[PDB]
Write a new protein. Sequence first.
Lengths: 206, 145, 56, 141, 63, 70, 63, 107, 143
Amino acid sequence: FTPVVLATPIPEEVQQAQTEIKLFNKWSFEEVEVKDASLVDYVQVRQPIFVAHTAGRYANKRFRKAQCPIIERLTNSLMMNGRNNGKKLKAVRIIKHTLDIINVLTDQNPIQVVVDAITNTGPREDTTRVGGGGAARRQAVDVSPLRRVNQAIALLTIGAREAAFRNIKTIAETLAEELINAAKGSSTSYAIKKKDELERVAKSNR
Amino acid sequence: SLVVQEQGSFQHILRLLNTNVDGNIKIVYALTTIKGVGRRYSNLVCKKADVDLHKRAGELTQEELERIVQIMQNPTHYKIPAWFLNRQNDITDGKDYHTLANNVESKLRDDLERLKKIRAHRGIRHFWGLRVRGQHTKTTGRRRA
Amino acid sequence: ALISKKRKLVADGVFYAELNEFFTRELAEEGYSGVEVRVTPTKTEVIIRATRTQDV
Amino acid sequence: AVPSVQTFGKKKSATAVAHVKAGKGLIKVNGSPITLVEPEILRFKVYEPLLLVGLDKFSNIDIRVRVTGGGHVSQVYAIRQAIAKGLVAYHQKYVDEQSKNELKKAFTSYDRTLLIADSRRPEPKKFGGKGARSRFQKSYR
Amino acid sequence: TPVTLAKVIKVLGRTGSRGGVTQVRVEFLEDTSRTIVRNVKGPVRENDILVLMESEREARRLR
Amino acid sequence: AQHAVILDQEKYDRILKEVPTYRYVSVSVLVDRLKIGGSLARIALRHLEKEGIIKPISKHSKQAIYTRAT
Amino acid sequence: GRVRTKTVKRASKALIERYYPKLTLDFQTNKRLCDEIATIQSKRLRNKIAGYTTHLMKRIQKG
Amino acid sequence: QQQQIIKIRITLTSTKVKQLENVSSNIVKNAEQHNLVKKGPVRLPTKVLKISTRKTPNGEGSKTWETYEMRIHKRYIDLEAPVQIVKRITQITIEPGVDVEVVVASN
Amino acid sequence: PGVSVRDVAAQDFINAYASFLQRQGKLEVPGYVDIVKTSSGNEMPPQDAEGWFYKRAASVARHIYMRKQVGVGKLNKLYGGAKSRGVRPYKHIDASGSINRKVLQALEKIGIVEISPKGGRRISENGQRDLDRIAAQTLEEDE
RNA sequence: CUUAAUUGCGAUAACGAACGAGACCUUAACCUACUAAAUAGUGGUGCUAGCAUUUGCUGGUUAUCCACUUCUUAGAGGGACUAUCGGUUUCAAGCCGAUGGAAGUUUGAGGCAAUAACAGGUCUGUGAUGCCCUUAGACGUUCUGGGCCGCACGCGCGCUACACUGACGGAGCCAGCGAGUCUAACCUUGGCCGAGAGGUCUUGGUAAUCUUGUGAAACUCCGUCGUGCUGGGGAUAGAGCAUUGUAAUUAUUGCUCUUCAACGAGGAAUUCCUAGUAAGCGCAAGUCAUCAGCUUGCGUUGAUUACGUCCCUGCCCUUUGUACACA
């Protein structure tokens, strides 16, 4: 199919998955379907990213931080504490490097990567401190249209790095089994601990 | 980290001139432990000594360790161009000296007790004890002194 | 020619500074207000226009 | 020959001077093949405004730009403006508007900042501080 | 689950002696002709989900 | 070393049974797999490498995932 | 933070001084007004005069 | 000898934006009324002349910072300066600051 | 299809071209081989006992088809990492001065050396007499 | 009642006004448009060298011809004014929810910023300012240099780590701000010498040419290790080498080798900060003969938690109380 005459020739196996429809190049990020529970309308796939370097302002108008792409949010959310401040172009290989370990373990291409994480391992809620006085019993103030994504993604990628330092385990290779353990997991990672200490306030005290 | 069949012929923990040897670490850290032995000639204990380098430190055997005694005692018989040396043209005869493990402070205080008695400015800051090589010592004196 | 362009086109500005005291530092009673700014090559045309164009 | 074409792109340090000559499909920055884009990750942000009207659109034209400057990505999505302005620069004029509304509707629903001349700039740093909004230490004593 | 889906049709603002907690309404998705005054976190836009956790209770004063 | 980093020399058959139905393993895993560690973490991919059970599915510097090939 | 100015007093006295039956939603005469009636001291004076005289002339088609 | 022209780079040092254009156009009209072929006026780009200083005369108080700038505008022309432009400077169209130097480059 | 060396890799190229010719035979180890720290502040020399001669000399040969000219004052100002610089923040200061000038005695045998007027380097087509002729067989080996 | 605003709607013994705020001006916010670029360079260029045999790549012929701006450009103008529709609101000021976007914080940050003052502080920017010892003992100049660094022991601004994103070497060599030589001298590429610092032969540019794409880190790609005051740390101390200056002693420094201090995320307290931003890194200019761990200006990846409250400090505006007015 349609090569071209030039002095820099072109391979074969890839861009026929691109010239036909506006989707991914080699991997089948294709026609697989979503498991959409509550948090309705939080899929930026169709039309997605491929890696997370999409140009566009996203953060000062807080009503459009939800149109920051939902696949980019887990990439947005890793690197702190005097070691990797800047060097956020380490987070662009992590994408295919956690679309590396996900290939051996439950591919579920990105109509299924992020929509499965917040359901049974993260919040459907928040518990913020406006707590009256003396000893702040926090109001268990539940889900907003922006409280399903921000701390549900950008702190569970942080508390699950606490074994990625002082010994062998790499930040790019800690992510082997935390997304799946955010998809379906019994806390071999940081799944329960943002619904353990904040939910003892949140169950029957309100 | 090469193809290895490490039996008991490999050297275990033994004193080799005041250091119980870490044999299991690499051959660059086979000896580089003693005062007088910095980490800088971890290359130039075994640079062109015809001993293999990608092996760990079970090599440089019991009498290939004899060269280690005289390669660092005599710095010139193996043709380093003498820029890799700690004390030359000292007080007496004006030639080279590689100050070994006993000879670390054996000779530097001879250059200090050279000078406790010859009145100089860096004399009265060592036996008193004072920061002689360029530090303001007002604000030095708070947590370090 | 031994005097650069960028760093010494401001060098003419001393002849707005050395000059606009030189007219009126002994002569602070003169009445200067800014002459018609003018130049020719090799020589500078001089006109006086002030309170005291008569006594000095 | 033909005078150079003032379709044209800008960015931080990578001026995407969208030249177009009579070409045959060279995907370069005037010097590098299609397998040698290759940071293994940033491969496609150069391309994908290319692969939108078809595979080639290379019958008469190539992509002829050269760029000095740059950061690490700041050329990769700079000349993708020039790779989008290096195609449609003559299809406005020579072929017609119904070849733009019923055939360059490819060039409508995948504008991820293509013809946008940029509007996001880091601000100059202040005075009286290291950072752009950060300040020094007070220590009221 | 004792939770119920709820459109927050009309927005108020938010309250508190610190700034966080919020006055909102709910208009449910199931069992209409029934409404209870509840709360929500924060940056809420119009007519979107409030999954609860309580069944039927109340929390009003926001200091 | 002290606890399963360098060789564990008596146990040379364990490298020859390297995937005990145990899919996820890398350089980043083998240190506390009671086998070779990040010092000599590659000698299971030195020993059984070219044609056999192990085939390369990863790339990155110093750290390489491997897998019993289907 | 989007409110009037101190040259909105005269952006409504010379606006209707002789010039009501023009200036619809059409933006062309919403500058070709202000090069003749006003001698332009800033290109922003189109932005400070005619930036409101269509919404204010939405108020005339109401009542 | 006479009116074979010797390809002199017409140029004019100033600082302003249209005051040089008051004086540079005394050549721009005067080179094209008798209609030479022209590939001409090159805007010498704007140069800033930053100086930093503390605003205060004594180093007490809040050490606030005041900054400094200029814009060096200049034009140089890639043409033949005719004989009726080269010594026209020496008794007309010269102004303090407008020191019309005329550099030479032909081949 | 018509080949340029600008249509050829330069990352694993030296891994497959200049290290394919690793044992051409003429060693050129002029006494300052592997005794010097090879960068003026970098505390360590190469400790592999293999290479870093074609990595410094033969890096230039296809580097110089990508440009006009270089010299050793752009070789020392090319490769300096973090400097062993006190209790103070680090920099990039230059690499070694006389050591990487060994290519101005090593390249002299090849013919990729041409010395130009107007200073600097000239590259003749002798690089095309060992790289454009290997553009017929080792470019089709990296599918 | 809104607003960043005594800015504005309006109610009115107030009417008209005038500052301050906004306007005002830079700079990052663009132009299929031309009078213009050999103080940048593209298309064919007279073309050549290989390879591939398809005007396909490198180099120039300081004019081979040019079309000459589309990168710095302004000669000026334009385009985004919450715009536009639903929800609000007295139907007005207003304010939200989606859309289109070069262009929806007040276009982002700055540019002098009012009334009134403050025993704020500079006679240390002046041989401005009444006041002395003034001068020939002088509480000052010429000059050898001390001393401004002196240390018992306190307090701030900053730098480096407190320990497996820890330490080490090589393939791509990427920025941005600016700066730069005169009667001698800065920037200094290219080549020989030296392992470094540098020595020397040279070259270009009094300025978009040239040093420079400042060939920066951090990174892109790989090989090495093993958690111990490790090869974390480089304080301290010793001995050699080149430079700046007339001279480095109390080491101005940069380089080589040896020695390898404390500590293992800091108590009462306390500094800054709502998106290209914190927080890591690095580049040029200032003083510069020599010396940056500091400042002025600039790049490179781009998180957290909060887009709301008066709770602690503060701050304006009313009502109130006052024996207070140096408040």
